[PDB]
Design a binder for this molecule. Structure first.
Ligand SMILES: [Mn+2]
Ligand SMILES: [Mn+2]
Lengths: 277, 277
C-alpha cells in the first residue's frame, strides 16, 4: 500500500521549526500539480526528543499530515548528512517515485515547473539524473589527525549539486539505500551526496535555473528552485506567481552565475559570467 | 559448501596465458601457508570463446584446479575494470574469506609474509582495509565528448592503489557486489576501484612494501608484492627465497619511492625520496 507519486519532495526541517513549515505548506508545497504528481513531506528526526516535544510533532502530523518523522535520526543543525541519507533510504523503501527534490526550509521551488520539465525529458535524459547547480572547485576545509582514517579525495570537493535544492532519479536513491552502511560523511550533506555518487554511472546536469548556492544570486523568473529565502520572501513570491504568473516582482542579478564546463578539469569548471541566471 | 580461507588471491590472467599460469602456480602461488590460509585462483573470462578454446581451459582446470572461469565475462586486454568487478562480485557470493589480494600475471607476492602481516593486525587495523601503494596525483587522460555523460571527478585521479597488487577486506568486496549495477568504469581497473571506494568509510593504507607501480622500483627484501616480473624473474625470486630466505639476490633501488602524505592535499601526497623501498 506504498504511496506513489511522480515527484517526491523532501524538505529538511528541524523539530522546532514549525512556523517555517506552516509558511512552506501554505505556499510552494501547496502548488503541487494534480493528484499523483507530488508526494511532499518535511523530514524531521525525532531521536532523543522528550515526551512533550514528540507530542507536539504528533499533533502537527494529525493536523497537517505532511511530516516524515524519522525515529532513529537525531536531528542536528551542524551537518545534515545523516538526515539526508536517512530520509532518502526511507523513501526508497516506502514510496514509489520517479524523481525526488531535496530542499531546505529556506528553499522555494516551483513544483509545477519542475514537473513539466521532468515530464518533457525523453528516457535518456531521465536515466540516473542528478540535477542542480554544481560546483567542481569547492574549497576543502582544513584537516586534522582524523584525515589518516579518512583521506582527502581531491584538492577540491568532488563535483556536487549545492544543497539549496537538487533532484535525483529513484534509481540513484536505491543505490544510496543499498550502500547505506558503507557511506562516509563529509562536513555538509550536499558535499557528502556528491561523493556518494562519485562511483556511479550518473547523469550530472548543471542548470542555472537552480539558485541554490550559499548566497542567492537574486531573482530570475527562470529559477525553478531558489534558496536563502526568508518567510517574507516566500510569501511575496507565492503572491507574485498567483498575480502575474512569474516568480519575481522585479528580476535582479545580485551575483554572476556560471555554466559548468564538463570539458575542463573540475577546478576550471565554474567561470562566473554575464548572461546566465 | 562454500570454500573458505583467510586470504583469497585472484590473479588476473587472459585465456591464452597458460604458460604464465604454469610458472605462477609453480612458484609464488605454491608457497601459500597451511591448509585454510589461502584460496587462490587465476581469473579468466570465457565469454565469446569458441569450443576448442573452452575445451583447452576445461582441460587445464581438470589438471590444476586453480582457474576461476567467468562465463559472463568477455576477457579483454585494454581495460581489466570489468574483470576485476566480475571476479570480486563472484568471490563475495561464493567464497568465505577475510582479505583478498588482487594481482596480475606479472606480479609476484610473498603469500606467507602477507598472511603473517594480516594476522598481526588488531581488529581496528583489519576493518575496511584497502592496502597497497597509493597515488593521489595520477594524471588524467585527455577527455572527449563522452565526458558530458561522465564528468571528470578530480583534476587528478581519486586516490587509488596501483594495480600490480593490492588487498581488500571482505566487507569492501561486499559493498562492490551490492553496488555492481551502478558502478562506472575508468580507463584502468586500479583507477576504477579507487573511485568505487571513494564514498566509503575505508581504511586506505599506503605501504612502500608494495612495488606495484607501472615500473618496478627494483628489488627490496622488504617487498610483499612486486610487479613487472618476467617469468625468469619469478623463477629467480622463488629460488632465492628457498635458498636464502630472502627475495633478492641483490637489493637494488632503481627508482625512488615515497610515503603517501595523508595530511596534505592529494596532489601533494607523493614526494619521491631516499630511505623508502
Ligand atoms: Mn538552506
Ligand atoms: Mn601487471
Amino acid at each position: 500500500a506504498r504511496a506513489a507519486a511522480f515527484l517526491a519532495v523532501l524538505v529538511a526541517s528541524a523539530p522546532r521549526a514549525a512556523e517555517r513549515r506552516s509558511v512552506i505548506r501554505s505556499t510552494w508545497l501547496a502548488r503541487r500539480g494534480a493528484p499523483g504528481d507530488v508526494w511532499a513531506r518535511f523530514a524531521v528526526g525525532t531521536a532523543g526528543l522528550g515526551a512533550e516535544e514528540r507530542r507536539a510533532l504528533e499533533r502537527e502530523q494529525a493536523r497537517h499530515g505532511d511530516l516524515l518523522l524519522l525515529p532513529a535520526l537525531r536531528d542536528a543543525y551542524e551537518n545534515l548528512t545523516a538526515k539526508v541519507l536517512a530520509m532518502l533510504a526511507w523513501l526508497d523503501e516506502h514510496v514509489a517515485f520517479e524523481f525526488v527534490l531535496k530542499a531546505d526550509d529556506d528553499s522555494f521551488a516551483r513544483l509545477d515547473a519542475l514537473l513539466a520539465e521532468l515530464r518533457a525529458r525523453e528516457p535518456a535524459r531521465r536515466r540516473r539524473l542528478y540535477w542542480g547547480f554544481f560546483s567542481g572547485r569547492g574549497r576543502v576545509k582544513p584537516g586534522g589527525r582524523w584525515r589518516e582514517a579518512a583521506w582527502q579525495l581531491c584538492d577540491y570537493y568532488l563535483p556536487y549539486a549545492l544543497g539549496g535544492g537538487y533532484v535525483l532519479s529513484a534509481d540513484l536513491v536505491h543505490y544510496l539505500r543499498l550502500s547505506r552502511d558503507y557511506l562516509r560523511a563529509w562536513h555538509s550533506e550536499d558535499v557528502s551526496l556528491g561523493a556518494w555518487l562519485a562511483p556511479v554511472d550518473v547523469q550530472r546536469e548543471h542548470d542555472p535555473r537552480f539558485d541554490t548556492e550559499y548566497r542567492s544570486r537574486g531573482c530570475s523568473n527562470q529559477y525553478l528552485v531558489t534558496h536563502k529565502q526568508s518567510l517574507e520572501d516566500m510569501l511575496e513570491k507565492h503572491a507574485t506567481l498567483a498575480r502575474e504568473g512569474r516568480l519575481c516582482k522585479r528580476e535582479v542579478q545580485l551575483r554572476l552565475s556560471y555554466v559548468y564546463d564538463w570539458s575542463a578539469p573540475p577546478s576550471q569548471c565554474c567561470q562566473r559570467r554575464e548572461g546566465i541566471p
